[PDB]
């Protein structure tokens, strides 16, 4: 019951500062603007220990299976090649994604109707709320 309130599909409804993060990650101009417009689908379910999280995007669509806590490779949708580890932390999904010496930081979390992801790169938030689909 693990990751009860996460499961199902959920819709881009909104997001802030979105550029910004991408910019401050490395991503280029065009995957920026192209990834920026999309409004993906964020689909999430769990079978025993295994936890997918899919996006199905105009951009790219992406598909990650995991155990929490045991690191994983991930192409990410702008093509890094990244080592990940997702765990719980105090009911909140914590993905790091380390590359080429850098880490960035995707949070998901349930509040109210919503989830709400909060992607950090060093000194840059970006804030994307999801709606149930
Ligand atoms: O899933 C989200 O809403 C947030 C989120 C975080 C990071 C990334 C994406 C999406 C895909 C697009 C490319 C940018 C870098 C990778």
Redesign the pocket.
């Known amino acids: 019951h693990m990751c009860d309130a996460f499961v199902g599909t959920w819709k ?1 409804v909104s997001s802030e500062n979105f550029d910004d993060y ?1 910019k401050e ?1 490395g ?1 280029g101009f065009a ?1 920026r603007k192209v ?1 920026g417009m999309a409004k ?1 689908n ?1 689909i999430i379910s769990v079978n025993g220990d295994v936890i997918t999280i899919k ?1 199905e995007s105009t ?2 669509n992406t598909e990650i299976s995991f155990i929490l806590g045991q690191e994983f490779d991930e192409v ?3 093509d890094r090649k990244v080592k990940s580890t997702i765990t719980l932390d105090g009911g909140v999904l914590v993905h790091v994604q380390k590359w080429d010496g850098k880490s960035t930081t ?1 949070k998901r979390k349930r509040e109210d109707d919503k989830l709400v ?1 909060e ?1 950090v790169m060093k000194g840059v938030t970006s804030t ?1 709320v999801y709606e149930r689909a």
């Open positions: 881009l991408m990650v991503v995957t990834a993906p964020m996006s951009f790219k990410t949708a702008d995707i992801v992607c994307r």
